[PDB]
């Protein structure tokens, strides 16, 4: 019964949004943690074969100078939201001569998280993680296909979400520092990955008021893993 | 006009037409390709030629600029529009910023186009995978493949089409850094990799190279027979 | 024919202090040689800490004032905080340039405090260029004000003149003296003088009458 | 003290036989509580205890 | 209104005055004409003010998004080409825009000149404005490719001094910048009334 | 169930099912209670965060200098009718140079949400508005529905198990008229403490309270200006 | 199966089921009647109060389209407000264009062609609303028109729309249209609006009355229900 793509459920909810949520579950995992000093962030590239070059894969693209990002699920759906969210930040800066706050970015995306239909096709299949430092401090955010945008202090996504959250409330408190959190992520990653953790599997991303920028180079990660 | 969402989410999370329409990739001609440190080499196989008829119109390695080579699998009909749109795109880039087209830019063009060609109303998604190889400005060679999802993805070597697991499993026994220390080892490496591919009788193997400053050279069936000669003589030396 | 511009007049004055900013404007709205009214203040409260003045053609002052006071509340509804004084300058540059090929006939002056407790007076032109200045004066009596504020605040062309910064009491007798002595020779500078003081503690307003002709 | 409006107001699709089983599991925890008598806080728990469905999770909202 | 730009062995020097009139009356003495676009580009102002501010600002938009896409800072000729494609569509509506584009590139030093009519020419030396013809004269006598840093500062300040002397539409400060490989750097801002004591003897 | 397909198809019983399923999307949202006096209007919501570490998703959002709305159900459509709400406020604020009365605002919500309930391929809006403001004749508490039928009440509540809030309110509707703010608010969120199970708080970190008055602009309080209101309540009974 | 779903398909016995389903969707709504006298049109709508639900004067099914024309809607309510806005706009077009006040005949045509115009496509659904139209002009007289969801518009002396429909139009033939003044006809409506819909189904109710004619001098307005309060003074004395 291929019905009427914008139709509610008997529960009810949007059928196709509820189907879209299950598309996050087969995507790769990620870890965000809000620090009082900044925002650290983690992901796994999921190398498929030694054929592939490992460093061309992007899971973190950096939206402005001061607003990081993390994508998930289908990447080619995510790239459109990345490129247009950058345009919305620049339009904010060229009407206003100030940095667009980290909050209003996700309103400016989630107002078109739901545009599917026939007149006026399918909803997006991505679950983004926005970081960044505005004047309100280091903020860590999270948006879904439904557009239901909420602040999350330390959010996991994807396939590992249940065990990563469930294991992650045990090891988190209010006064986390940065280099504590950075090695506090890779423990969870080496628990949840299937390939051996090394210099080609994961990538970190940090953004701070006083440690910037401050992006993500190699051979930092070599020192990061060897501290285990 | 034509308002109907063709491609919708299945309840187990998949898109169908994206993750189903790769079967048209699975039932087309094969194409492999490696990159040398100096000269790249890509080639189509399983040509299934009529062997008494014309051959330049079934040529499925082409160019966008001289900087960029093509290779693809799947049904060629949908690939033609992707090629021509890619060419019209890569010419206006010359009209803008005066360096020639970097290969990563044009792969983001085919990938972004093919994504919004899945996303829109009333449009069947493309059923092609394709390769885009070109030694860029500042002399650095690299390659990318496409996807009907639209996920450009940089490999060191290729296997797309029929039996991509076979050749892609084979090139792990290739990737010793001796191969390729010589360009003749790269070309005979590709053809010797296409030995495990379909029939390999010296007819359906069409290979083309690019020597990092030259326009792409479609090689005649002249040294393909000599590379089969040194490959078969090398297998005579293998025992 | 129907010539869609008419000159009204009025003269806007702004002086940026150390922690304050004084915006002042005359009130005589006049077309041609007649007098339409003797009370029509130009100084407009935008936020708590930013006061705009608008002279020139009057209908574009009303229209521009209402568009600005709309987009302020749109910014407040979007981003949970008021517009900074630096942001209003850029937005007004885009608005004043948005009608470039059928232009406004309006001289704009924005005064108000910045983030750090300092006087930030921005000025404009009808095409929409802008700059930060310590003191400006638009309208029909710019050439009757600007060298005098240069002689009092700017300290140009004076030798052996020690430099005191502008105090709060000194700027008031400056504004009163320039509107009296400027109002003596000008015709478009009129009876009531609105004075708005922008402090860190809110908005103070004071109105002093002048000669009645 | 039992409202009997509590259920009656919150009864939706509840069959007359389900109400027979509402007092059962309410009395079943009253059993394993070692309680002498049944109370509404024990009653009203049995409302959502028998129906509906779940467990699933309580989150996003809490 | 006089800007001037010339490239030598060490990057590109840009200098301009600050006076911007309105008819015979002078609006202000402190208009900062050389508009900062990026940390590695510099644009100037000529003729109209709001046109150069607006269209160079809108150039900075596409340059920043270009950097956010291709992970590379944009070349100078690309910025000039995008600016000319933006200006050209309004030909016949009356834009007065005499900007210049300066910056460092992979090919080294760089300079281009963009008119509102649609001119786009590279070059060694330029001067744009009303007092520009007063600046080519003294600028072409002391110029070669091989100059020192203080020598180029003294030339590029002297030429603005003759421009603000002889022309009436030029005056105010002398805003002097310096473009290098690692991004531009401000040099100084000397007032003309102080410079007359210096070069008068 | 083949006539459960679209919004176009009438039932053979006379009840268009997509509206009923959208009412089910109204009931799945959290509880919120709006109730007025003769001199003020107070609407109180209850947030429901996802996990422990994620902050609670807010409900009450500021709209105009006197108009404020609660929400339950979907969020993106709440931003959609939110942006339409702002735009139709400052349209007449731009033209007539007076604020809009509420009772002619809500007809734009009914005529706005009407057309996506009739034409083909348009869903209704999962929406839970509790509108509150001043016109010149005092306060008003409205509610909406995805069927676009707006009710002028004196007190309502929508959301999960909100019927218990109603059966609280009916035995105090004779006393919800004269009283001023400080007991009116706690008279508000007593209904919220009946919307919960009786074994967990009633915390400070979740409840949000919005008030609109004559000498009091529309204001949202969040846990900390709320902390002076939650002090001094009665214990839940045994 | 398959013949009831879309609106644009005839059924093999020869009628349209979506229209027939639209007719009995109004059948579930409450009773609202109307009647005209020799110089005016009297409306009456019985309204439902269970316990608390709404403040007095919420969602009044009596509307006011023009200066001299009003609605009395019953059925689903939202589409009735949509027809109120459209008929409002049509009176605005006639008022703006031709200079004089809209007759009730043109208004019945221009609304009824829209209600018909949503029964020809599967783009939309047929409406689920039915409404009265009362009016008075000295060169016109009092007319009372009746529009169903199918699109049929014609003329009554008196009508009734609701659940209790036949029982609430049984008694209207007892009354006399020709002689009576409408000031009697107000309580002559309220007696059977109090009589019909007996209180075992719903415990309580509340009455609206709207009255246009010669006494109101062309303007249509609600009568002040407190003023003269003639309804329940007769209605409590009408049980025996």
From Swiss-Prot, chain B:
<dbReference type="InterPro" id="IPR029055">
    <property type="entry name" value="Ntn_hydrolases_N"/>
</dbReference>
<dbReference type="InterPro" id="IPR050115">
    <property type="entry name" value="Proteasome_alpha"/>
</dbReference>
<keyword id="KW-0647">Proteasome</keyword>
<dbReference type="Pfam" id="PF10584">
    <property type="entry name" value="Proteasome_A_N"/>
</dbReference>
<dbReference type="GO" id="GO:0019773">
    <property type="term" value="C:proteasome core complex, alpha-subunit complex"/>
</dbReference>
<keyword id="KW-0539">Nucleus</keyword>
<dbReference type="GO" id="GO:0005829">
    <property type="term" value="C:cytosol"/>
</dbReference>
<dbReference type="InterPro" id="IPR023332">
    <property type="entry name" value="Proteasome_alpha-type"/>
</dbReference>
<dbReference type="GO" id="GO:0005839">
    <property type="term" value="C:proteasome core complex"/>
</dbReference>
<dbReference type="InterPro" id="IPR000426">
    <property type="entry name" value="Proteasome_asu_N"/>
</dbReference>
<dbReference type="GO" id="GO:0070062">
    <property type="term" value="C:extracellular exosome"/>
</dbReference>
<feature type="modified residue" description="Phosphotyrosine; by ABL1 and ABL2">
    <location>
        <position position="152"/>
    </location>
</feature>
From Swiss-Prot, chain C:
<dbReference type="GO" id="GO:0005634">
    <property type="term" value="C:nucleus"/>
</dbReference>
<dbReference type="InterPro" id="IPR023333">
    <property type="entry name" value="Proteasome_suB-type"/>
</dbReference>
<keyword id="KW-0647">Proteasome</keyword>
<keyword id="KW-0325">Glycoprotein</keyword>
<dbReference type="GO" id="GO:0034774">
    <property type="term" value="C:secretory granule lumen"/>
</dbReference>
<feature type="modified residue" description="N6-acetyllysine">
    <location>
        <position position="176"/>
    </location>
</feature>
<protein>
    <recommendedName>
        <fullName>Proteasome subunit beta type-1</fullName>
    </recommendedName>
</protein>
<dbReference type="GO" id="GO:0005829">
    <property type="term" value="C:cytosol"/>
</dbReference>
<dbReference type="GO" id="GO:0070062">
    <property type="term" value="C:extracellular exosome"/>
</dbReference>
<feature type="modified residue" description="Phosphoserine">
    <location>
        <position position="34"/>
    </location>
</feature>
<keyword id="KW-0007">Acetylation</keyword>
<comment type="subunit">
    <text>The 26S proteasome consists of a 20S proteasome core and two 19S regulatory subunits. The 20S proteasome core is a barrel-shaped complex made of 28 subunits that are arranged in four stacked rings. The two outer rings are each formed by seven alpha subunits, and the two inner rings are formed by seven beta subunits. The proteolytic activity is exerted by three beta-subunits PSMB5, PSMB6 and PSMB7. Interacts with SERPINB2. Interacts with RFPL4A.</text>
</comment>
From Swiss-Prot, chain D:
<protein>
    <recommendedName>
        <fullName>26S proteasome regulatory subunit 6A</fullName>
    </recommendedName>
</protein>
<comment type="function">
    <text>Component of the 26S proteasome, a multiprotein complex involved in the ATP-dependent degradation of ubiquitinated proteins. This complex plays a key role in the maintenance of protein homeostasis by removing misfolded or damaged proteins, which could impair cellular functions, and by removing proteins whose functions are no longer required. Therefore, the proteasome participates in numerous cellular processes, including cell cycle progression, apoptosis, or DNA damage repair.</text>
</comment>
<comment type="subunit">
    <text>(Microbial infection) Interacts with HIV-1 Tat.</text>
</comment>
<comment type="similarity">
    <text>Belongs to the AAA ATPase family.</text>
</comment>
<comment type="subunit">
    <text>Component of the 19S proteasome regulatory particle complex. The 26S proteasome consists of a 20S core particle (CP) and two 19S regulatory subunits (RP). The regulatory particle is made of a lid composed of 9 subunits, a base containing 6 ATPases including PSMC3 and few additional components. Interacts with PAAF1.</text>
</comment>
UniProtKB/Swiss-Prot annotation, chain G:
<comment type="similarity">
    <text>Belongs to the peptidase T1A family.</text>
</comment>
<dbReference type="Pfam" id="PF10584">
    <property type="entry name" value="Proteasome_A_N"/>
</dbReference>
<dbReference type="GO" id="GO:0043161">
    <property type="term" value="P:proteasome-mediated ubiquitin-dependent protein catabolic process"/>
</dbReference>
<dbReference type="GO" id="GO:0005634">
    <property type="term" value="C:nucleus"/>
</dbReference>
<feature type="modified residue" description="Phosphoserine">
    <location>
        <position position="238"/>
    </location>
</feature>
<comment type="subunit">
    <text>(Microbial infection) Interacts with HIV-1 Tat protein.</text>
</comment>
<feature type="modified residue" description="N6-acetyllysine">
    <location>
        <position position="52"/>
    </location>
</feature>
<keyword id="KW-0539">Nucleus</keyword>
<comment type="function">
    <text>Component of the 20S core proteasome complex involved in the proteolytic degradation of most intracellular proteins. This complex plays numerous essential roles within the cell by associating with different regulatory particles. Associated with two 19S regulatory particles, forms the 26S proteasome and thus participates in the ATP-dependent degradation of ubiquitinated proteins.</text>
</comment>
<dbReference type="InterPro" id="IPR000426">
    <property type="entry name" value="Proteasome_asu_N"/>
</dbReference>
<dbReference type="InterPro" id="IPR050115">
    <property type="entry name" value="Proteasome_alpha"/>
</dbReference>
<keyword id="KW-0963">Cytoplasm</keyword>
């Amino acid at each position: 019964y291929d019905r009427g793509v914008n139709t509610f459920s008997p529960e009810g909810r949007l059928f196709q949004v509820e189907y879209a949520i299950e598309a996050i579950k087969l995507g790769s995992t990620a870890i965000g943690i809000q620090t009082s000093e900044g925002v650290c962030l983690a992901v796994e590239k999921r190398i498929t074969s030694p054929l592939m070059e490992p460093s061309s894969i992007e899971k973190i693209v950096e939206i402005d100078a001061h607003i990081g990002c993390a994508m998930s699920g289908l990447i080619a759906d995510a790239k459109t939201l990345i490129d247009k969210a950058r345009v919305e930040t620049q339009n904010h800066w060229f009407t206003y001569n100030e940095t667009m706050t980290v909050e209003s970015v996700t309103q400016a995306v989630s107002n078109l998280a739901l545009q599917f239909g026939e007149e006026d096709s399918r909803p997006f299949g991505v679950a983004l993680l926005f970081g960044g430092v505005d004047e309100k401090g280091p903020q860590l955010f999270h948006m879904d296909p439904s557009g239901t945008f909420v602040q999350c202090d330390a959010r996991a996504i994807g396939s590992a979400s249940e065990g990563a959250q469930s294991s992650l409330q045990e090891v988190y408190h209010k006064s986390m520092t940065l280099k504590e959190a950075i090695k506090s992520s890779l423990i969870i990653l080496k628990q949840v990955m299937e390939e051996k953790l090394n210099a080609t599997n994961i990538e970190l991303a940090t953004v701070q008021p006083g440690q910037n920028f401050h992006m993500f180079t190699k051979e930092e990660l070599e020192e990061v893993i060897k501290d285990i | 006009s034509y308002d109907r969402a063709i491609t919708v989410f299945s309840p187990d999370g998949h898109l169908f037409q994206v993750e189903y329409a790769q079967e048209a990739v699975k039932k087309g001609s094969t194409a492999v390709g490696v990159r040398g440190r100096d000269i790249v080499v890509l080639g189509v196989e399983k040509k299934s030629v009529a062997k008494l008829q014309d051959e330049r119109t079934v040529r499925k390695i082409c160019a966008l600029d001289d900087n960029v080579c093509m290779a693809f699998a799947g049904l060629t009909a949908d690939a033609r529009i992707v090629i021509n749109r890619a060419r019209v795109e890569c010419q206006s880039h010359r009209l803008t910023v005066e360096d020639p087209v970097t290969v990563e830019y044009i792969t983001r063009y085919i990938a972004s186009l093919k994504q919004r060609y899945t996303q829109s109303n009333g449009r069947r998604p493309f059923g092609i995978s394709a390769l885009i190889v070109g030694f860029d400005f500042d002399g650095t060679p690299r390659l990318y493949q496409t996807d009907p999802s639209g996920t450009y993805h940089a490999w060191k070597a290729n296997a797309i089409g029929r039996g991509a697991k076979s050749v892609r499993e084979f090139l792990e026994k290739n990737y010793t850094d001796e191969a390729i220390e010589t360009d003749d080892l790269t070309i005979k490496l590709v053809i010797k990799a296409l030995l495990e591919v379909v029939q390999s009788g010296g007819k359906n193997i069409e290979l083309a190279v690019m020597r990092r400053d030259q326009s792409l050279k479609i090689l005649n069936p002249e040294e393909i027979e000599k590379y089969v000669a040194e490959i078969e003589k090398e297998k005579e030396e293998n025992e | 024919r129907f010539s869609p511009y008419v000159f009204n007049g009025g003269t806007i004055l702004a002086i940026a202090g150390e922690d304050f900013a004084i915006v002042a404007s005359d009130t005589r709205l006049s077309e041609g040689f007649s007098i339409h009214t003797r009370d029509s203040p130009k100084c407009y409260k935008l936020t708590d800490k930013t006061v705009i003045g608008c002279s020139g053609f009057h209908g574009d002052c009303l229209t521009l004032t209402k568009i600005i006071e709309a987009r302020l509340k749109m910014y407040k509804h979007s981003n949970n905080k008021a517009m900074t004084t630096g942001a209003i300058a850029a937005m007004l540059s885009t608005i004043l340039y948005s009608r470039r090929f059928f232009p406004y006939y309006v001289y704009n002056i924005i005064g108000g405090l910045d983030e750090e407790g300092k006087g930030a007076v921005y000025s404009f032109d009808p095409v929409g260029s802008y700059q930060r200045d310590s003191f400006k004066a638009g309208g029909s009596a710019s050439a009757m004000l600007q060298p005098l504020l240069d002689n009092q605040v700017g300290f140009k062309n004076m030798q052996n003149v020690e430099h005191v910064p502008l105090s709060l009491d000194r700027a008031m007798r400056l504004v009163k003296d320039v509107f009296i002595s400027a109002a003596e020779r000008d015709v478009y500078t009129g009876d009531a003088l609105r004075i708005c003081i922008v402090t860190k503690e809110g908005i103070r307003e004071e109105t002093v009458s002048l000669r009645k002709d | 003290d039992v409202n009997y409006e509590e259920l009656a107001r919150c009864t939706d699709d509840f069959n007359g036989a389900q109400c027979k089983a509402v007092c059962v599991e309410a009395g079943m925890i009253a059993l394993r509580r070692g309680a002498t008598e049944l109370t509404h806080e024990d009653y009203m728990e049995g409302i959502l205890e028998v129906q509906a469905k779940k467990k699933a999770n309580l989150q996003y909202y809490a | 209104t006089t800007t001037l730009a010339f490239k030598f062995r060490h990057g590109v020097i840009v200098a301009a005055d600050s006076r911007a009139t309105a008819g015979a009356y002078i609006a202000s003495q402190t208009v900062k004409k050389v508009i900062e676009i990026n940390p590695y580009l510099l644009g100037t102002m000529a003729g109209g003010a709001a046109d150069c501010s607006f269209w160079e600002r809108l150039l900075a938009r596409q340059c920043r998004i270009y950097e956010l896409r291709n992970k590379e800072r944009i070349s100078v000729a690309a910025a000039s080409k995008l600016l000319a494609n933006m200006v050209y569509q309004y030909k016949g509506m009356g834009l007065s825009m005499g900007t210049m584009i300066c910056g460092w590139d992979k090919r080294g030093p760089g300079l281009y000149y963009v008119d509102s009519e649609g001119n786009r020419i590279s070059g060694a030396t330029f001067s744009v404005g009303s007092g520009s013809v007063y600046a080519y004269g003294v600028m072409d006598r002391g110029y070669s490719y091989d100059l020192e840093v203080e020598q180029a500062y003294d030339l590029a300040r002297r030429a603005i001094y003759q421009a603000t002397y002889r022309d009436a539409y030029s005056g105010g400060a002398v805003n002097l910048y310096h473009v290098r490989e690692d991004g531009w750097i401000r040099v100084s801002s000397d007032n003309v009334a102080d410079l007359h004591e210096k070069y008068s003897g | 169930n083949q006539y459960d397909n679209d919004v176009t198809v009438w039932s053979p019983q006379g009840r268009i099912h997509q509206i009923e399923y959208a009412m089910e999307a109204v009931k799945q949202g959290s509880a919120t209670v709006g109730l007025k006096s003769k001199t003020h209007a107070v609407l109180v919501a209850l947030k429901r965060a996802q996990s422990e570490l994620a902050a609670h998703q807010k409900k009450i959002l500021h709209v105009d200098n006197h108009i404020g709305i609660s929400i339950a159900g979907l969020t993106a459509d709440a931003r959609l009718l939110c942006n339409f709400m702002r735009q139709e406020c400052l349209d007449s604020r731009f033209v007539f140079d007076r604020p809009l009365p509420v009772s002619r605002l809500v007809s734009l919500i009914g005529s706005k949400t009407q057309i996506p309930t009739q034409r083909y391929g348009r869903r209704p809006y999962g929406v839970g508005l509790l509108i509150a403001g001043y016109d010149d004749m005092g306060p008003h508490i409205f509610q909406t529905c995805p069927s676009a039928n707006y009710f002028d009440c004196r007190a309502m509540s929508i959301g999960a198990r909100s019927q218990s809030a109603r059966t609280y309110l009916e035995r105090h509707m004779s006393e919800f008229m004269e009283c001023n703010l400080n007991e009116l608010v706690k008279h508000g969120l007593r209904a919220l403490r009946e919307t919960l199970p009786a074994e967990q708080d009633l915390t400070t970190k979740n409840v949000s309270i919005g008030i609109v008055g004559k000498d009091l602009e529309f204001t949202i309080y969040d846990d900390d200006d709320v902390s002076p209101f939650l002090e001094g309540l009665e214990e839940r009974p045994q | 199966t398959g013949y009831d779903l879309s609106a644009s398909t005839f059924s093999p016995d020869g009628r349209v089921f979506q229209v027939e389903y639209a007719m009995k969707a109004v059948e579930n709504s409450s009773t609202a009647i109307g009647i005209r006298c020799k110089d005016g049109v009297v409306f009456g709508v019985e309204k439902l109060v269970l316990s608390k639900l709404y403040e007095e004067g919420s969602n009044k099914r009596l509307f006011n389209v023009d200066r001299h024309v009003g609605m009395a809607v019953a059925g689903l309510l939202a589409d009735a407000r949509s027809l109120a806005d459209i008929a409002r706009e049509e009176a605005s077009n006639f008022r703006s264009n031709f200079g004089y006040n809209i007759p009730l005949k043109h208004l019945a045509d221009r609304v009824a062609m829209y209600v018909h115009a949503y029964t020809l496509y599967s783009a939309v659904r047929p409406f689920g609303c039915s409404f009265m139209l009362g009016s008075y002009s000295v060169n016109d007289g009092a007319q009372l028109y009746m529009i169903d969801p199918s699109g049929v518009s014609y003329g009554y002396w008196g009508c009734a729309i609701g659940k209790a429909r036949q029982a609430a139009k049984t008694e209207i033939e007892k009354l006399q249209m020709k002689e009576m003044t409408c000031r009697d006809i107000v309580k002559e409506v309220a007696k059977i609006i109090y009589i019909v819909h007996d209180e075992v189904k719903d415990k309580a109710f509340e009455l609206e009355l709207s009255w246009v004619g010669e006494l109101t001098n062309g303007r249509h307005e609600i009568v002040p229900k407190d003023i003269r309060e003639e309804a329940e003074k007769y209605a409590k004395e009408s049980l025996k």
